[PDB]
PDB file of C-alpha atoms and ligand atoms in Angstrom:
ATOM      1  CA  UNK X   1     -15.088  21.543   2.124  1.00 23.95           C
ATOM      2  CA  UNK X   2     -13.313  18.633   0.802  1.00 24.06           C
ATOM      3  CA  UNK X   3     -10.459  16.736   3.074  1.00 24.42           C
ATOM      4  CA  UNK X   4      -7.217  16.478   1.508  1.00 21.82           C
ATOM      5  CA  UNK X   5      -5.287  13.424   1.973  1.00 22.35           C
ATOM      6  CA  UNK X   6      -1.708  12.426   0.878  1.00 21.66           C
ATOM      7  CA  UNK X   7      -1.001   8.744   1.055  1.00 20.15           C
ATOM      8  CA  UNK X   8       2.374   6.863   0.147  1.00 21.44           C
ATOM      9  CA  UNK X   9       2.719   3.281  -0.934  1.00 22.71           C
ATOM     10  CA  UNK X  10       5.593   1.144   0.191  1.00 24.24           C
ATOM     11  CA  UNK X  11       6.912  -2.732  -0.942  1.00 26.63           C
ATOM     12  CA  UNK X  12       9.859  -4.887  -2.265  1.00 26.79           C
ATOM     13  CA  UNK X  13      10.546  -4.251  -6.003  1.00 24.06           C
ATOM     14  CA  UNK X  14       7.783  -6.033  -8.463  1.00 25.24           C
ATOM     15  CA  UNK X  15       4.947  -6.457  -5.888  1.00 23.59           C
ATOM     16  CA  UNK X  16       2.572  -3.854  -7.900  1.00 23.03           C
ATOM     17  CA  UNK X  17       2.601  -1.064  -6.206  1.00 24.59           C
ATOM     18  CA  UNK X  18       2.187   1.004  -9.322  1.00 25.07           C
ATOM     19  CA  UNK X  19      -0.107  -1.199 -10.909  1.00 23.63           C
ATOM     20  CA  UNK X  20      -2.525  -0.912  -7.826  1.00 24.13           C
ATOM     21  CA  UNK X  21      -2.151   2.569  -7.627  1.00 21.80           C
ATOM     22  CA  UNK X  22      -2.735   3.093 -12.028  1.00 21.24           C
ATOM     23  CA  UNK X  23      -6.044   0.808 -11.457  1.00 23.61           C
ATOM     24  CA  UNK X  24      -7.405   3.055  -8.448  1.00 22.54           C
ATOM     25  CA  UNK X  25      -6.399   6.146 -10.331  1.00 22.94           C
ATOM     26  CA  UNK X  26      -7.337   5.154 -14.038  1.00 23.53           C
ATOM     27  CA  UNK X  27      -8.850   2.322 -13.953  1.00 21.22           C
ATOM     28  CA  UNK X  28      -6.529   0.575 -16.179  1.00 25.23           C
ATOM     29  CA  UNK X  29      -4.144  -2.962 -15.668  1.00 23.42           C
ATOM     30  CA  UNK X  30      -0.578  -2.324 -16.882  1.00 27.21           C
ATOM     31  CA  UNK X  31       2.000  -5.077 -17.682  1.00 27.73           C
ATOM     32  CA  UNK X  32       4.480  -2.312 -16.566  1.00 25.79           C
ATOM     33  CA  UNK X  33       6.430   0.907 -14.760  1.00 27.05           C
ATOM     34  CA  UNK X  34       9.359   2.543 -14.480  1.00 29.36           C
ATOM     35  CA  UNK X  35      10.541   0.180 -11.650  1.00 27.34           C
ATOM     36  CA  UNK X  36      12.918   3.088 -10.369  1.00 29.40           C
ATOM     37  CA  UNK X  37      11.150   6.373 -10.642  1.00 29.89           C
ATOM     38  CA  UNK X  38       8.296   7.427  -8.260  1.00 29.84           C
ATOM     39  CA  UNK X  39       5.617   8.708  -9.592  1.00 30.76           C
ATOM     40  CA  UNK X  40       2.436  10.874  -7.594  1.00 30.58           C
ATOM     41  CA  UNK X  41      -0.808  10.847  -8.755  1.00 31.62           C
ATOM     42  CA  UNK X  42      -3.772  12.465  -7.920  1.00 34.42           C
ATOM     43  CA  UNK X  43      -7.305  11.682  -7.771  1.00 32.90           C
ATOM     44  CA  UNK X  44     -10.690  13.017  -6.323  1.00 32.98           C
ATOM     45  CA  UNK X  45     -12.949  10.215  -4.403  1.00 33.30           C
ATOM     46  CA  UNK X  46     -16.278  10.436  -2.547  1.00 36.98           C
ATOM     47  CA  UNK X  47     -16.150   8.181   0.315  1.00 38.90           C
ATOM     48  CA  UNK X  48     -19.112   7.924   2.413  1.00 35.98           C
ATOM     49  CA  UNK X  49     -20.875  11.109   1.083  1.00 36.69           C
ATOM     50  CA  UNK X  50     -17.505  13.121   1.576  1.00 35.49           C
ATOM     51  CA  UNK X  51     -15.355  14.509  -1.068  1.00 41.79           C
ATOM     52  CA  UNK X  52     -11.700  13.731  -1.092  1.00 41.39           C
ATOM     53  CA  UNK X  53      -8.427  15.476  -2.872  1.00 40.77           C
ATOM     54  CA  UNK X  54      -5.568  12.334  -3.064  1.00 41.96           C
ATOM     55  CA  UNK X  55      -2.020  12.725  -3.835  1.00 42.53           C
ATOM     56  CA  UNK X  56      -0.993   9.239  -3.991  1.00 41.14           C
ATOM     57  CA  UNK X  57       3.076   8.430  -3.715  1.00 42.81           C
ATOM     58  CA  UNK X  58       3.730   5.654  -5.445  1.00 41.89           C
ATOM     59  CA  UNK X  59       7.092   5.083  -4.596  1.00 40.90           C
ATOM     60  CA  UNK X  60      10.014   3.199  -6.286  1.00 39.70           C
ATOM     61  CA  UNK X  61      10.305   0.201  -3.509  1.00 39.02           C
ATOM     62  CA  UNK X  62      12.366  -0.692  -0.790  1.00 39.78           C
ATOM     63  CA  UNK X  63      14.527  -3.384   0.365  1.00 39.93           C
ATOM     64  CA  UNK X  64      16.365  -4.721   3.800  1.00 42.23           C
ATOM     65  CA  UNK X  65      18.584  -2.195   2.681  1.00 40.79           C
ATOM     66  CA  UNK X  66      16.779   0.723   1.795  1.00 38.92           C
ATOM     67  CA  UNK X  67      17.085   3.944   4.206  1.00 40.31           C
ATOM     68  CA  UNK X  68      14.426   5.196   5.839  1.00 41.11           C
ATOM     69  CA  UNK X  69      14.167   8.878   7.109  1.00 40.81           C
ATOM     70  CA  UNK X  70      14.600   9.038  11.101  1.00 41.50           C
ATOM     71  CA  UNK X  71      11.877  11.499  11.594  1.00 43.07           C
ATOM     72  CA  UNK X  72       8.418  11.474   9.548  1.00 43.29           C
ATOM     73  CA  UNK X  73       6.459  14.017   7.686  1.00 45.00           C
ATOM     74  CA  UNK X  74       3.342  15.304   8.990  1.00 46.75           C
ATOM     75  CA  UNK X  75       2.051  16.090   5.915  1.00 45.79           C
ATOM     76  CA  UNK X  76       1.814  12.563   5.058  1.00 47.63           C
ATOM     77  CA  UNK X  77      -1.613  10.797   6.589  1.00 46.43           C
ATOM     78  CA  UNK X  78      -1.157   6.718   5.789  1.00 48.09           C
ATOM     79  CA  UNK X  79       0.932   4.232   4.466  1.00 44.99           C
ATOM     80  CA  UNK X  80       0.168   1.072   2.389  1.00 42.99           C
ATOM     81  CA  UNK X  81       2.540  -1.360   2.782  1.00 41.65           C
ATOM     82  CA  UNK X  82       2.193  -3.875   0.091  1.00 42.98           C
ATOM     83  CA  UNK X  83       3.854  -7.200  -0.768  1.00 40.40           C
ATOM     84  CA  UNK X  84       2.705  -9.912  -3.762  1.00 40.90           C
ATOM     85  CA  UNK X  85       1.116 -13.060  -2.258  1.00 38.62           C
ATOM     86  CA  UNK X  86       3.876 -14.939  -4.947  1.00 38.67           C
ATOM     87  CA  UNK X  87       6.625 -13.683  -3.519  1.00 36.52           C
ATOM     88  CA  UNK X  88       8.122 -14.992  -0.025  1.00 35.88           C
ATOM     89  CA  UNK X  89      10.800 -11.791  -0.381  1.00 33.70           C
ATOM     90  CA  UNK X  90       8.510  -9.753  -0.606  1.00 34.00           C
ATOM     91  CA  UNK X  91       6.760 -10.887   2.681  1.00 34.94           C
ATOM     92  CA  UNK X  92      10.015 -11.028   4.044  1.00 37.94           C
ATOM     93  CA  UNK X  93      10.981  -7.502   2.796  1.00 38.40           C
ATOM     94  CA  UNK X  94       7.769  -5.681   4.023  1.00 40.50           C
ATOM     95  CA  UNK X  95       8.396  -6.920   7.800  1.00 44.63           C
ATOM     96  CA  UNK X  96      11.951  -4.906   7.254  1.00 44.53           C
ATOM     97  CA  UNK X  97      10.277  -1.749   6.162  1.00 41.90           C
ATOM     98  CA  UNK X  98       7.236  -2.233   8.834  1.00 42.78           C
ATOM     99  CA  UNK X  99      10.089  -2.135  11.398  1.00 39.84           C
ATOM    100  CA  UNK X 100      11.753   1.146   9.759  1.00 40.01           C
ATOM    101  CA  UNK X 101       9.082   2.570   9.321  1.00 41.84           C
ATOM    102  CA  UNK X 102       7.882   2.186  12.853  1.00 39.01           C
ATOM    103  CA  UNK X 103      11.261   3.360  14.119  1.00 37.71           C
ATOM    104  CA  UNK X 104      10.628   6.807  11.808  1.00 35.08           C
ATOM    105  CA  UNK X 105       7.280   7.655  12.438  1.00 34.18           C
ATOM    106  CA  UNK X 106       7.060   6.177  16.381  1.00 34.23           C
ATOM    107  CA  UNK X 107       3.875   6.433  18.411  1.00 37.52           C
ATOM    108  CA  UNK X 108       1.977   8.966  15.772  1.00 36.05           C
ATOM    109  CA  UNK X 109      -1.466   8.146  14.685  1.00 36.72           C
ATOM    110  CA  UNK X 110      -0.942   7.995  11.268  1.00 34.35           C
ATOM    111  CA  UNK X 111      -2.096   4.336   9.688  1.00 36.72           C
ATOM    112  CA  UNK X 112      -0.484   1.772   8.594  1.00 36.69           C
ATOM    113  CA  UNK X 113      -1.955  -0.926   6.380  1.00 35.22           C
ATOM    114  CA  UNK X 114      -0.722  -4.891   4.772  1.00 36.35           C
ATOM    115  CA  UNK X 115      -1.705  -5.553   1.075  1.00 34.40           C
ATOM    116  CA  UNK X 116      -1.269  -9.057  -0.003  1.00 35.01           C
ATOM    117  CA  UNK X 117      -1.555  -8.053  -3.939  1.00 32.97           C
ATOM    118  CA  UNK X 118      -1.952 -10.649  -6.852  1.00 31.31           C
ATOM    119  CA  UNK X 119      -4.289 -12.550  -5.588  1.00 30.40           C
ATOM    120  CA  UNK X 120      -5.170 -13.519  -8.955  1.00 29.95           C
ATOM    121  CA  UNK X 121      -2.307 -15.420  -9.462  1.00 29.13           C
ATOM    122  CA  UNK X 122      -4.023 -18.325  -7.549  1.00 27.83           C
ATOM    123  CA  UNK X 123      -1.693 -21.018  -9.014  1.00 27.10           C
ATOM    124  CA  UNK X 124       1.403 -18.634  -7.750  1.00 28.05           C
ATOM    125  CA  UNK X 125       0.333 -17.967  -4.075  1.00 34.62           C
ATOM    126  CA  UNK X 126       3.487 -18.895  -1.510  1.00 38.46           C
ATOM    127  CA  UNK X 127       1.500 -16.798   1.275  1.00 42.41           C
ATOM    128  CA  UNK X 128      -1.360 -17.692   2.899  1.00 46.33           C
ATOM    129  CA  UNK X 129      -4.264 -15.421   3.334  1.00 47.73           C
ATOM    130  CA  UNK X 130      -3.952 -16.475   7.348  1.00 48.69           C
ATOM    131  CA  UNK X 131      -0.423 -15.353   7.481  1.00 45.24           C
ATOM    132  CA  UNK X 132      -1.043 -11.841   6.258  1.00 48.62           C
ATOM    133  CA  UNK X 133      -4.007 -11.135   8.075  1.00 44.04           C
ATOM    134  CA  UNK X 134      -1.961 -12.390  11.300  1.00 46.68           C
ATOM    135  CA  UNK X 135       1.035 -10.404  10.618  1.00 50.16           C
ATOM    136  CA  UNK X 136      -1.181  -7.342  10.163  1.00 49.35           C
ATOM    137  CA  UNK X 137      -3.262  -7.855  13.624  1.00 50.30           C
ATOM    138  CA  UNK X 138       0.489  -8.321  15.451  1.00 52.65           C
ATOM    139  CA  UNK X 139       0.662  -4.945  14.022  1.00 58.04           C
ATOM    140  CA  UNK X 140      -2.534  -3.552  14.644  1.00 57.83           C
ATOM    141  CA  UNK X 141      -3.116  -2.515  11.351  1.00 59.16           C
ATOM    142  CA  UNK X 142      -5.939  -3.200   8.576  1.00 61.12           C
ATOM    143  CA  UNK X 143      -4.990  -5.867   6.359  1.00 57.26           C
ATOM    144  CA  UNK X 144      -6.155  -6.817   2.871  1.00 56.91           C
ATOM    145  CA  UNK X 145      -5.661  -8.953   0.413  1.00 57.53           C
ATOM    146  CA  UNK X 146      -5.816  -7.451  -3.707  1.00 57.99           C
ATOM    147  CA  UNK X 147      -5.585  -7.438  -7.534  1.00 57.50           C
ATOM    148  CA  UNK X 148      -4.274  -4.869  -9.386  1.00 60.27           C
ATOM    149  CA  UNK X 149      -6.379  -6.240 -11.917  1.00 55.79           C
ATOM    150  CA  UNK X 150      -9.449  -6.078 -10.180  1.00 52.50           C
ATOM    151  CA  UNK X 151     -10.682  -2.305  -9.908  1.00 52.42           C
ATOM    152  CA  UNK X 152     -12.914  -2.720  -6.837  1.00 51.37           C
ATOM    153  CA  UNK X 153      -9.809  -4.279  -4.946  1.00 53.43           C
ATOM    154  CA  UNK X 154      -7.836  -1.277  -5.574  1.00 52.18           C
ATOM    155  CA  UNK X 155     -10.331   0.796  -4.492  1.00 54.82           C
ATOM    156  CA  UNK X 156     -10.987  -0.930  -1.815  1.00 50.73           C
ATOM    157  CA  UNK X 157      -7.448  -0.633  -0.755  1.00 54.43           C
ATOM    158  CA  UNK X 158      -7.239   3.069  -0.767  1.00 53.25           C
ATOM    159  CA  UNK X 159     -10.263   3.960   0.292  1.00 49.71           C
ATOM    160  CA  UNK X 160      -9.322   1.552   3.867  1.00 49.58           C
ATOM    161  CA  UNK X 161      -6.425   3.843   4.484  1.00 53.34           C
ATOM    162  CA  UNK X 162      -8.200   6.740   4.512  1.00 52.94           C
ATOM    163  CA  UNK X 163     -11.050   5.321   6.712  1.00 52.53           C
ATOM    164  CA  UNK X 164      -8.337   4.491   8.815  1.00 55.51           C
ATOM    165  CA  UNK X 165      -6.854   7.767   8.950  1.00 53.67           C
ATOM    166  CA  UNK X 166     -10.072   8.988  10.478  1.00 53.23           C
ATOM    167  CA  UNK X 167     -10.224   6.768  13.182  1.00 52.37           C
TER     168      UNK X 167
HETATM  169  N1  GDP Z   1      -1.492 -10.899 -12.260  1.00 54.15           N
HETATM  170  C1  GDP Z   1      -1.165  -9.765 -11.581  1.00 54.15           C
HETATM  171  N2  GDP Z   1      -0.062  -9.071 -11.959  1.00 54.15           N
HETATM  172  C2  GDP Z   1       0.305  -7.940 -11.307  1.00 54.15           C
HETATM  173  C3  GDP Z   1      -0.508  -7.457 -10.189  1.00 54.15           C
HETATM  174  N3  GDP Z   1       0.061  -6.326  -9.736  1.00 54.15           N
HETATM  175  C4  GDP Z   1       1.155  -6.107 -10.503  1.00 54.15           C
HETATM  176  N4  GDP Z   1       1.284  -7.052 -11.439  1.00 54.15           N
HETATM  177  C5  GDP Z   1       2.363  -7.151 -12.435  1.00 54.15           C
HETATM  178  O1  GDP Z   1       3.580  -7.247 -11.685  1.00 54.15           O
HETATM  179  C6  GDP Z   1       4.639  -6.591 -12.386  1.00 54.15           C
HETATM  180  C7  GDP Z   1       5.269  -5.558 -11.474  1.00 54.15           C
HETATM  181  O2  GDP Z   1       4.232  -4.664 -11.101  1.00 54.15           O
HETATM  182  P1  GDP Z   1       4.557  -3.168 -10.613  1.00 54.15           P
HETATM  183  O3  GDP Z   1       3.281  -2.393 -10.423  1.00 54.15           O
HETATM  184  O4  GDP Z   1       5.506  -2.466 -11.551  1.00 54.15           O
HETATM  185  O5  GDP Z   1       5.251  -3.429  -9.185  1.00 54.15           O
HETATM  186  P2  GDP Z   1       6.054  -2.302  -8.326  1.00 54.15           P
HETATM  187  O6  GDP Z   1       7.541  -2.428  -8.631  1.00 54.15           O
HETATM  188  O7  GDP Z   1       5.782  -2.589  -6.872  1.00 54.15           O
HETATM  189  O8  GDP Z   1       5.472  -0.963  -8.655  1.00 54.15           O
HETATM  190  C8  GDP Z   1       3.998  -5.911 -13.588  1.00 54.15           C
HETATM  191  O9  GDP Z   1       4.221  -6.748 -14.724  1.00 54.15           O
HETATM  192  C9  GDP Z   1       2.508  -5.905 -13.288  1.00 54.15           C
HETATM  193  O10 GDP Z   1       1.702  -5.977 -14.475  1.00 54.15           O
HETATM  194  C10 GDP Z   1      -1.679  -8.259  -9.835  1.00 54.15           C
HETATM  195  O11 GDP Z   1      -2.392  -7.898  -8.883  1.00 54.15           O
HETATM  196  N5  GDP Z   1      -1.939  -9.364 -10.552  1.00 54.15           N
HETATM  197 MG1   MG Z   2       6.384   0.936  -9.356  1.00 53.74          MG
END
């Protein structure tokens, strides 16, 4: 009766992919993670009236020179690519893995999302809001911007990627 969904998050090193994922899943704001292990969580939403299992992958990030896989797994049903609005790498770096990842999975329907996380950090921003939601509509994918601090952000995050999924 309830839909099972596994999602894994992507990004440059630092961008808070574990701290948005630890929000969603606990509600909590850490300073921070073991930057080189990944971790999978799991959590049980109601979205819309219907129950679903997560299993979150919060990976340890990627750079230009991570390796990606050449074929996908099916058992996988979105991706959140994320990337801090303070860091121009980062933006930089999460075009790189778009492309990989594109090249791995190929014409699949399985979703693809942008983050622009640490919004917050108002006095740190180096990308614009415009350039994010741009890059994200060249890729025809849902873009957002959030705050690992913020719970409703996070939420709002994951619960995108699985509307998304079911599209
Ligand atoms: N102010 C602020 N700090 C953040 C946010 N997200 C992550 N951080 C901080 O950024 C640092 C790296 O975050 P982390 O989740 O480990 O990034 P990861 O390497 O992508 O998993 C940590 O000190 C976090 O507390 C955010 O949205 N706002
Ligand atoms: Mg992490």
């Amino acid at each position: 009766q309830s839909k099972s969904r596994k999602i894994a998050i992507l990004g440059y090193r630092s961008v808070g992919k574990s701290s948005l994922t630890i929000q969603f899943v606990e509600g909590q704001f850490v300073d921070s993670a073991d930057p080189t292990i990944e971790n999978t969580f799991t959590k049980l939403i109601t979205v819309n009236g219907q129950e679903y299992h997560l299993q979150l992958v919060d990976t340890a990030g990627q750079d230009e020179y991570s390796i990606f896989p050449q074929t996908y797994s099916i058992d996988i049903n979105g991706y959140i690519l994320v990337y801090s609005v303070t860091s121009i790498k980062s933006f930089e770096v999460i075009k790189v893995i778009h492309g990989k990842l594109l090249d791995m999975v190929g014409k699949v329907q399985i979703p693809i999302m942008l983050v622009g996380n640490k919004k917050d950090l108002h006095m740190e921003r180096v990308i614009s809001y415009e350039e994010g939601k741009a890059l994200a509509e060249s890729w025809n994918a849902a873009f957002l911007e959030s705050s690992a601090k913020e719970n409703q952000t996070a939420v709002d995050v994951f619960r995108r990627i699985i509307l998304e999924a079911e599209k």
